[PDB]
Design a binder for this molecule. Sequence first.
Ligand SMILES: O=c1[nH]cnc2c([C@@H]3O[C@H](CO)[C@@H](O)[C@H]3O)n[nH]c12
Ligand SMILES: O=c1[nH]cnc2c([C@@H]3O[C@H](CO)[C@@H](O)[C@H]3O)n[nH]c12
Ligand SMILES: O=c1[nH]cnc2c([C@@H]3O[C@H](CO)[C@@H](O)[C@H]3O)n[nH]c12
Ligand SMILES: O=c1[nH]cnc2c([C@@H]3O[C@H](CO)[C@@H](O)[C@H]3O)n[nH]c12
Ligand SMILES: O=c1[nH]cnc2c([C@@H]3O[C@H](CO)[C@@H](O)[C@H]3O)n[nH]c12
Ligand SMILES: O=c1[nH]cnc2c([C@@H]3O[C@H](CO)[C@@H](O)[C@H]3O)n[nH]c12
Lengths: 237, 237, 237, 226, 237, 226
Amino acid sequence: ATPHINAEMGDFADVVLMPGDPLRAKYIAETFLEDAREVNNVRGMLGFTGTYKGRKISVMGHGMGIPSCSIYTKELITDFGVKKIIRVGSCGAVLPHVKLRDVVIGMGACTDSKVNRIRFKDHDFAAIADFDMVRNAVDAAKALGIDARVGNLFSADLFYSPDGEMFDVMEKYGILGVEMEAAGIYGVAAEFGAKALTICTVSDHIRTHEQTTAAERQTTFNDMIKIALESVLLGDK
Amino acid sequence: ATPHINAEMGDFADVVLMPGDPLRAKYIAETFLEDAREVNNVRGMLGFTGTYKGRKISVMGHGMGIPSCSIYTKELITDFGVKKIIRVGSCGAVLPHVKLRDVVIGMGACTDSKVNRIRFKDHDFAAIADFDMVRNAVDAAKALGIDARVGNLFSADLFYSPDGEMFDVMEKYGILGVEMEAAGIYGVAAEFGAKALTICTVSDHIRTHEQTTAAERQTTFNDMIKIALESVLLGDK
Amino acid sequence: ATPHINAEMGDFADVVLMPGDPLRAKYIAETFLEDAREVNNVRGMLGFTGTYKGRKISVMGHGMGIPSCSIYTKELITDFGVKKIIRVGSCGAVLPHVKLRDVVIGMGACTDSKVNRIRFKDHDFAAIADFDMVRNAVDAAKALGIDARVGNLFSADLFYSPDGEMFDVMEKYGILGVEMEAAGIYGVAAEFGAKALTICTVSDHIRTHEQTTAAERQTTFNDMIKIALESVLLGDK
Amino acid sequence: ATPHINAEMGDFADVVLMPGDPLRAKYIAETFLEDAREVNNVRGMLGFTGTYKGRKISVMGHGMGIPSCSIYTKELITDFGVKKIIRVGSCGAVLPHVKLRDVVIGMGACTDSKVNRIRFKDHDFAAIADFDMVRNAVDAAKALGIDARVGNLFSADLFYSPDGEMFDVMEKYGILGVEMEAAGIYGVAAEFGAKALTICTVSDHRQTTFNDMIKIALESVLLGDK
Amino acid sequence: ATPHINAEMGDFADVVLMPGDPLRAKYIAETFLEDAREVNNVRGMLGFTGTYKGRKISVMGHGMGIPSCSIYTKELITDFGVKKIIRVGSCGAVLPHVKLRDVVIGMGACTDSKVNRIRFKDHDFAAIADFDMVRNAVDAAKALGIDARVGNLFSADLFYSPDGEMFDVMEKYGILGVEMEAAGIYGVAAEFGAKALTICTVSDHIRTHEQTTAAERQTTFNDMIKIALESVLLGDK
Amino acid sequence: ATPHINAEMGDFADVVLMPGDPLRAKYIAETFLEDAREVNNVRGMLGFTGTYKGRKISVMGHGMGIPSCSIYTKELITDFGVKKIIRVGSCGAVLPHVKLRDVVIGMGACTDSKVNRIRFKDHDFAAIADFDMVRNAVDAAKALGIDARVGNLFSADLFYSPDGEMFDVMEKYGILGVEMEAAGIYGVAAEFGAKALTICTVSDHRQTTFNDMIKIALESVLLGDK
Ligand SMILES: O=c1[nH]cnc2c([C@@H]3O[C@H](CO)[C@@H](O)[C@H]3O)n[nH]c12
Ligand SMILES: O=c1[nH]cnc2c([C@@H]3O[C@H](CO)[C@@H](O)[C@H]3O)n[nH]c12
Ligand SMILES: O=c1[nH]cnc2c([C@@H]3O[C@H](CO)[C@@H](O)[C@H]3O)n[nH]c12
Ligand SMILES: O=c1[nH]cnc2c([C@@H]3O[C@H](CO)[C@@H](O)[C@H]3O)n[nH]c12
Ligand SMILES: O=c1[nH]cnc2c([C@@H]3O[C@H](CO)[C@@H](O)[C@H]3O)n[nH]c12
Ligand SMILES: O=c1[nH]cnc2c([C@@H]3O[C@H](CO)[C@@H](O)[C@H]3O)n[nH]c12
């Protein structure tokens, strides 16, 4: 029971999948988990706990932005005993060879936010994911015939950047996807001694075309979730 | 319809009160607006439009953190003709002479975010509110017989900051309350040509203790609302 | 007597108007204060104390730049019981709809100085003026039938800046005037527990042309003075 | 030939093992490489090219510090077609559980240098290694019955830092070892489209551990070829 | 004729000595120059031109602070053909071996100001004096039996630092004297292609005693001026 | 012995000439020094101590970059009693009037490194040389009928900078030559109470010019002894 979560120790699994959209968490709960129960509803950030193939799993939205997800992941780790957090969201692409519906795994996350500099005496803290979590995800994807890209994500503070001059830079230094919280989650995981990983599905790209079908799009998003769910089972072993 | 708001031009009033919590927006629409109709629920970010003493007005959540509210205030200003934004949120107090439930009006807002430096070529942009709006709010207050301090708020990126020594600095410079989005809303208001004001209810004390569930609905949180709603009326004259 | 002011406690009123130019202070004492007596001349920084409609009040120059006025405002606040400081200076306009002789009231002040970052642990401190003082000045104006915009000023370190592209940035964010000390006076006022306000007369246009010698004395520079002096009277009530 | 490498395209393998110490490149050529030949000597920074189990491989030191390794890394990549760079060196530890001689693999590298900020418009660039190369190093170590820690490294610009308070910070955020070039090499790999990885053995808080690291590095390349 | 100087080309010598105090410039003029004439009086910043041993020399105050002296030295160089500027002021000492009345020559100047970073793409610009000017000063002092110290000065933006933690740092890295404009003058000299040098006499030190006599103090200040005047004669050769 | 110098107090003179290239230390020992003896070899960074006209002097390279030279500079100063350090190297020019082979003396050194900011609480530290040493170098060059420019140097962290726009800035503020360690050495000298100077010959915009620089450096020490 924290100011942002009305639950108690035991209410969450030691592993939590986190989409940015609270309505997405209910979607995941109802689609992949059995015997799911809502364990939080404060300010509409729905959280759920259930089981995936006999394994206890939790799913809860983290909202948009590093400041938002930082609050939730921190409380989950320090107040609910959560050991692993897997963010499952969307991202925009800047690289020409990265196409719509590609599954991206952020082994690292670049950012224009100042949270990690505030943490790291103003120096460069490399916000990285937990290695084992990354390989578990890579292997799970492989078992599903889904080949994922592993690299750098860029966590933006401004979805509407005042000057898109930064997109050429991201492209130049090869970041795979553009989103808004990976660098924040990794900073939190490092600060409170937990493990985190964010997986994204490319929903848009700079230099668009047509629009792609929702069915195929929704299919890839489900694969991403399965990869996430299945990767934790591999970790349990 | 914008990326995060499934609404059409005209569904929102030219003035929108915005708490961080979607459920508080629902509460405000139910408790203060006559004939309130829901105009958004995309990521659970409820938006409503109704009337207050014949005046058409809207209320919608903006989520936690500068990145979140920046998205919403921006789409509202550019795609829904919104002219004024009044944040009605909660905050933490750092000064000893500031008690819980106190109402604070942020004429200015300090921040540890990099967002404004990214806009102002890495210099110091003074994130200020629209003068008339502050005066309207101060007058509305006096007319309702409610106390309210006018001053600097501090918009933090990390609700759980690793640097507690900064609270001493905030206090020394008399910042009235610690919240998480004022400086970002003022930056958007300026970047996109709109006006804004942040009103907060001290929901906890950084040096002492906090509160719970009342943040979604409390007479003092009702005072903040009355002031906000009444100040709009004064602005129309 | 302080390092830069050869005066004793009581030689200054609790309110001091301060232009950058020592000669303008002399002009103000001669043209507006009854029974004005000189209380300082150490580095040629003339200070005077007299009365305006029975109200005891002082006027003294603060020199050019944040480092200069920081010295004077500080000694005044800590060693001469000064409670209020009203800067009555000149500035450059960057917006097209701002003509020469216009009166600007800085509720806020952006800056490229590092002074406030040194005070606020390298974060963004919103250098703001005392709310009541701004309101007093706005009311005094209306009562004198003089126009006056209220907004952000930009306090520059270099009058001859190598970065002209920054004027475009200032303009974009609607800063009302470019001067050189407002943000420093507000920082001192906050650091040393006093209140302050900056009123400026647009003495030139960054995009167009300037003026000369009138800055030491002009009806419009007289308007700034009347507003300042009258606002004090309103503050006393 | 480039300003710091008197050689031509083809002289270097597409993979280059890089120790800090120049003296160690020759020791690696004679000890692990077959049919090695000298391909550089410009400033005593000796380079060699040979094979390891048929695989073409080169060895050459990079010098101490980001500025130094950045020069060699960049030149090899843009002028000699090098596709992968594996730095093999030593580091100091700040974590109690990290013991001397432990093998550490830098999936990422923090730094107090401005080098990447200058590249990333003053924002935070996560200097990271290539995942496959990381995984290959881990699998190779395992096959050699060696436990390798995978985490963050810290690339210091000042070996003798004026403030030791930063070591508490490194320990708090779990960095595995303190060295001086990983973040620099990662920046270059990112900037010029190539892959990189640095493997280090904890020297403070030897030939065997050193030979172990090279074996790991070399064996990881063959795995990567699969 | 610029907004800060009411003179015309030819009114100044191609070499100007500059104390911070306008009243000090009149002192220098009347004490060492013959046939001296006031060539500026705008905002009280007295400037004078005369001859020293047949050589045409000018003397004018620059006010306190980098922003102030930056305006004057810039206009002198670009609008009055001034080739050399020699600042002659006072400074405080932090080193134990640097005693009261020591003559310090700033071959370099450290600063907490942001002016040079703004000029130098945010990197480290080493603000240095003109070598020949430095050796001319060292040799002149020698001819007068005055041995001067040559090293780094620290140009502060805040005479009243919010946290004197920087004084141990200055001492640690060996800066000889603490003043307020050297780094600014050198930045200007570099930007507009001129030559500058600042010479200071230690007027105070951290860890005081007695107070020293004004006569001896005034004697050393005069020596500093003679060194300045005489060093330019050596440059002419 | 220190981490990077296997020697004892007394082995080094109180003055040390430091070229970047290790190979150049031995060439200087055999060409200009009398009775030279080897005093270091830890990473091929050879050091020698001998005399020049009776004066005791040492020579040893510092490597490329601030991080590298900072290590050697610091160790020599705090553990071997070195009082003066003279770096002798090459640089690139951005000013039209500065010609190839010109001799440049860095009275000051700008930089894009964070090294001094970390030392100076993130403020601006003017990395400068010792005045006397500067004047001695100038007087020695004169006596050798050589014109030496005295001004600012720029110590780059990235030999291959991602933005060339900075070279216009260097030219605008009159920096004489672009190199990679002057600001680093000056920081160390300041931090540990010693004196330093870097002299460079413009290599781009040779043995003779190089020998000229060493002669200048060596002759400047004798002047400094007066
Ligand atoms: O192109 C993009 N840019 C920035 N964020 C996102 C996102 C994700 O969607 C949300 C905002 O649209 C954020 O929570 C972010 O994680 N998807 N596509 C993009
Ligand atoms: O003590 C506090 N610190 C930081 N933010 C807040 C808030 C506000 O509440 C939300 C997080 O609890 C944010 O939207 C923030 O603006 N209330 N109390 C505090
Ligand atoms: O266009 C301008 N730019 C910067 N400062 C000023 C000023 C003010 O006048 C003085 C310098 O001319 C400073 O004190 C500054 O506040 N007037 N016009 C301008
Ligand atoms: O404790 C340490 N600190 C910093 N660097 C190192 C190193 C490595 O040794 C060299 C400097 O001694 C650097 O090139 C660095 O990679 N080993 N142990 C340490
Ligand atoms: O101890 C000191 N600190 C900072 N400045 C000064 C000065 C000089 O005196 C003026 C302020 O007192 C400034 O113009 C500065 O150059 N003298 N002594 C000191
Ligand atoms: O044009 C140049 N740019 C940067 N450094 C140098 C150098 C020197 O050469 C080495 C790198 O090539 C560095 O150690 C530096 O001191 N010479 N010419 C140049």
